[PDB]
Design goal:
Chain B: It is found in: Cytoplasm. Chain B: It catalyses: L-serine + hexadecanoyl-CoA + H(+) = 3-oxosphinganine + CO2 + CoA. Chain B: It is an enzyme of class 2 (transferase). Chain B: Keywords: Acyltransferase, Cytoplasm, Lipid metabolism, Pyridoxal phosphate, Transferase. Two copies of one chain form a homodimer. Chain A contains 14 helices and 14 strands. By secondary structure, chain A is α/β, with parallel strands linked by helices. Chain A has two domains: 140 residues, Aspartate Aminotransferase, domain 1; 235 residues, Aspartate Aminotransferase, domain 2 (3-Layer(aba) Sandwich), CATH 3.40.640.10. The first copy, chain A, has a seven-stranded mixed β-sheet, with helices on both faces. Chains A and B meet through helix 1, helix 2, helix 4, helix 5 and helix 9 of A and helix 1, helix 2, helix 3, helix 4 and helix 5 of B.
Chain lengths: 398, 386
Amino acid sequence: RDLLSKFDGLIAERQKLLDSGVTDPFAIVMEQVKSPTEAVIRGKDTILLGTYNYMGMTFDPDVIAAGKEALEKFGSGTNGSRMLNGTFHDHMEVEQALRDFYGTTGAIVFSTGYMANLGIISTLAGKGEYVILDADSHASIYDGCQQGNAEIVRFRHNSVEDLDKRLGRLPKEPAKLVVLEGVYSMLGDIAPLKEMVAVAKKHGAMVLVDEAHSMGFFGPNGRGVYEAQGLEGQIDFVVGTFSASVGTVGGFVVSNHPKFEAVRLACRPYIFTASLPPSVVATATTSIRKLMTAHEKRERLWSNARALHGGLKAMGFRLGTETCDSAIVAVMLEDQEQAAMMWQALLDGGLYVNMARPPATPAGTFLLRCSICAEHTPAQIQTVLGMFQAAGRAVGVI
Amino acid sequence: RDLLSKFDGLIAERQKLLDSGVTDPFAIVMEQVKSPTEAVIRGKDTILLGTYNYMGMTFDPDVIAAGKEALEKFGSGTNGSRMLNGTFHDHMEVEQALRDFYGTTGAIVFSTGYMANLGIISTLAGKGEYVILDADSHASIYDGCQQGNAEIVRFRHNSVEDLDKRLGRLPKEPAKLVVLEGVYSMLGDIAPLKEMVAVAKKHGAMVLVDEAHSMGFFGPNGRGVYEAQGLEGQIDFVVGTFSASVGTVGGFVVSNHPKFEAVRLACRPYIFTASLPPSVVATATTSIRKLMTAHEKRERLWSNARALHGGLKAMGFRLGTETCDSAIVAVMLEDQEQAAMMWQALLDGGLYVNMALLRCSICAEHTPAQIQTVLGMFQAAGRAVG
C-alpha cells in the first residue's frame, strides 16, 4: 500500500464502466472545435450540448481580436501575483468592466472561479463565525468552507423554512455569511432568493450569491437571478466566473461594501498565485462589455432553452425542473447504467452531453446535463430533440 | 460590526503608509509592457527585475504565434472541466509536452500552480496519514495541508537533521508525503535534496518536490534541482507552474507512478474548475518544447545572475546567499522602513524590484548593459538610503 491505494475504488468503478462497453466519459477530446455548438470527437462531427458557453462568446470576432492584440502587445503571461508585478493594463480594465456590468463600486478578479469561492468564503468568515450554505452548493463553495475556520451549517436544498430554522438556532452575536446560488449547476433550478434573503437579513446575516450560471440572461441588465427577483442593493457579495458566458477563464467577486478593497490584502488565493495572462483578461473585458447589450443572443438562448426543456418533457423524460427556469436541462435517469447507455447512444449518434454522478450531483442522482447556448440554430435543436427521442426509446427510458 | 470589520487593522496599516507619502507596493500597474525586461509604470520607463519570467518566454515569436493560432482555431475558452467538455487538442498536447520535458509517463495539468499544490497535497494524504514539509514552504503548500485531513509535521528550514528526527518519531505504517522545494523563492537558496530524499526514503515516505523556480536552467535537461543533484528516478512527484519559465498560467504535477492517472478521478481542484483556454495551453506547449533546448537563454540567465550577485555583494549589500545559486538574488535590509525607502528610490530611478528584503530576479533576456545599469542604480540608492 502507498498514498494512491486509496484510489483503488475509483479505478475499479472506471474500469467496470469501460468493460461494460462504454467510452470513457472522463477522457473525451475535442480534436477540433468549429464553433460554440460543433466539435469533432474521434473523427465524428458532433453537436455540443454539454458546455457553459451560454452566450456563445468564445468565437466572437471582437473578443478574438482583443485576445490576439493583447498577446502581441503584452505577451503570453504576467509572471507574477497581482500584489507584485502581475497587474497590467488589462487586469485593471477587466475589473472596471465588472464594476460597469454589475453597477458596483467593488470588483476583485481571481485566477479561477474555484479560487474566488475558495478565497472569499475562507477569508470573510473566520473562527467563531458561521457559514450557512445550501446543500446543493457547488464543490468550490464547500471547499472554501473546508479551507476556512468558521462553523459550517448546511440547509435543505431550496428550503426557506430550513434556512430560517437553522439560522434561528445559532447564537445572535457572531457574524454570519449565508451562501446561495442563483442557478444551481446540476439540476438547472433557481433559488428563491427573494425569500431566502429576507430570512438571512432577519437573522442579521450577510449574503453571498453565486451567479455563474445566469450572467447576461437574467435581470434587466443581465446581472443574475438576484437582479431578476428585485434584490438590487440587498446582496452583499456576488461571485461569478469568466469561464461560462464570458468565455475565457477566471473568477470574480463584486460588492458595494466600502471596505471591499481590503479583501485583496487578506485573501490567500488572490495573493499567492500568478495573475491571468493579458489575453485572458483582454478577451474577458471585451466579452463582458458586449454582454451588457447582447439582446439578440439573450432572446435566442431563452427560445432554445424553452424548446429543449418543453420537448424533452413532452416526450416523457423526468427532468430536474418542472418548468424551464434556466439554460441547463437535466435529464434524470434511474442508475449509473441507464445514464451511461443513454450517453453512449447520443455520443455515437453525434451529440455530446454531460453525464454526472455524485459528488458533482445531488446524492443518489444519475443525470445527463444538457445546456443550450445562444448560438444553437433551430435546425440543431430539432436534430437534438429527435436524437433524444430515438435514444430514449432505444434504451427504454421513455 | 460585520464580516469586514476584521480588516480594520490592515486598512489602518495601509493608510499609515499612504499618509507617510510612500508608494503603495501592492498597487503597481504595468501600463505598458514592452518586453520581458521593460515596462512603463506611472509614465516612467522602468527595468523589470522583480518577475519570474526566468527564461523570457513571454514575447517569444513562436509562442505568440501559437497563441494566436489557438484563438483562431479553438476560440477564447473551453467552457468546461477537463472531466467533461474542456479537454481540447491542445490540453492533450501540453500534457505530452510535460511527459517529454520531464521524461515521465504521467502528467496532469491544473488551471493554476496554486491549485496543483492545493489539490495534490490534499488528495494524496488522507485521514491518519502525514504531510511533512519545510517551515518555509510556499503558501499554496500550507493551504493544501489545511484543505486536507492529514496530520501535518513542519520541520526546521533546510534542516536534514530535523527532518530525520521528526520522521523517526512517527508510526511506521501510515503512509507519508515529504514535501520539498528545489529553489526557495524568498532568499533564492537551494534545498539539500540529495540528503533530504535519502532521509525520506529511509523512513518509507513518498517525496514531492516543487521545481517552479528551476525550470529550464537546472540539470542537464532543465528539469530542476532534483535532476542537478542526481535524483532522477527517485522523486515520486514533481510539481511545477506554467507562470514562471513557461510564461503563461497554470500548474502541473508529473510522476512515473502507475496509478497516477487516477488522481484525475479524485482531485477536487482538477475536477471542479474550467480547463485553461486553448491559447494558454498552446502557448505553454510551444514554450515547454523550446525550453528543452534553450541553451542560449540558459547561458544568458546564469551570466546575468552571476553579474548581479557578484556586483551587489562586492558593493557591500548583505545578500540571502553567499554564492550565486539561483536566478533569485535577495538583498537583506534591517527594517520594514529601510526596505521601503530602498524600494521607493529604485522605483523612482526606473527599476522595479519586489519588496517582501528586496527580491531581484534576473531573466535570460536582460542584456549586459541592463545589468550594469541596475548595478549603478543599486549603488546610488544604497548610498542615498545609507
